[PDB]
Design a protein around this ligand. Structure first.
Ligand SMILES: C[C@]12CCC(=O)C[C@@H]1CC[C@@H]1[C@@H]2CC[C@]2(C)[C@@H](O)CC[C@@H]12
Lengths: 250, 10
């Protein structure tokens, strides 16, 4: 039998995205954050192309298609960055981009050291849990469907159906080489715990970027127009509790 | 929003 679902996820996975950072200049808070913001915008372009090509994504109302991307991009990007960090440098540094790698000095200079260490821990877990490339792909897709509005989406039913199907695919990937139900259960527990761990990190980053945008003119940090829009219009909905992550565990 | 919507639309 052909692994149709996984074939698609591998086929649509975005390639390498560079930040455009000048590594020849001494590190500075303004330059590092301005580059992270530019990287955010560049990756968002790829996240949109990727999301729109996901199995069943078109089943969603168009307004919901746009909403889920605008609410989940932080978690999606952090998860992918953690995977890059693990695969490329064994979690020794945060591999935001080939031209924007953070050692501890840069983590400190960025003024979000605590968040960076939590992301480094996330990266390490990909190794400790022996996450396979296929589990990574399925989990990342699930992250796109893990944050929704309290007031409900345009067509909440279509979204619930799609999320359920992605969870089913994750079950299938776990069962592939596991014949015992207990072994599958243990793996599902591990993976859902890992997925949940992305949310608190994403919220801390949402808070940090929101505060940074508000005082950006005072610290010389540049925000691309689109990022400024999303962080001032969508992110506050999350921070004010109107849009919340779907946790597997409490 | 507008900027994102335009991106999303292509
Ligand atoms: C999503 C990005 C950029 C893409 C990535 O690899 C993960 C990383 C996590 C920190 C984000 C950054 C984009 C710009 C932000 C939002 C800064 O304003 C503060 C936190 C930064």
């Amino acid at each position: 039998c052909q692994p149709i679902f996984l074939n698609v996820l591998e086929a649509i996975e975005p390639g390498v995205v560079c930040a455009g950072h000048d590594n020849n200049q001494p590190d500075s808070f303004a330059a590092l954050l301005s580059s992270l913001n530019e990287l955010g915008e560049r990756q968002l372009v790829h996240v949109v192309k990727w999301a729109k090509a996901l199995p069943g994504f078109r089943n969603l109302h168009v307004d919901d298609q746009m909403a889920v991307i605008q609410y989940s991009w932080m978690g999606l990007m952090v998860f992918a960055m953690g995977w890059r960090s693990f695969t490329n440098v064994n979690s020794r540094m945060l591999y935001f981009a080939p031209d924007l790698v953070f050692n501890e000095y840069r983590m400190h200079k960025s003024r979000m050291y605590s968040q960076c260490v939590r992301m480094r821990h996330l990266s390490q877990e990909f190794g400790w849990l022996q996450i396979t490339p296929q589990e990574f792909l399925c989990m990342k897709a699930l992250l796109l469907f893990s944050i929704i509005p309290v007031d409900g989406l345009k067509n909440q039913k279509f979204f619930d159906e799609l999320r359920m199907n992605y969870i089913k695919e994750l079950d299938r990937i776990i069962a592939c080489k596991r014949k015992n139900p207990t072994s599958c259960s243990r793996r599902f527990y591990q993976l859902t715990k890992l997925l949940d761990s992305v949310q608190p990190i994403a919220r801390e980053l949402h808070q940090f970027t929101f505060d940074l945008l508000i005082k950006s003119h005072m610290v010389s940090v540049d925000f691309p127009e689109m990022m400024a829009e999303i962080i001032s219009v969508q992110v506050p909905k999350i921070l004010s509790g109107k849009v919340k992550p779907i946790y597997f565990h409490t | 929003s507008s900027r994102f919507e335009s991106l999303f639309a292509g």
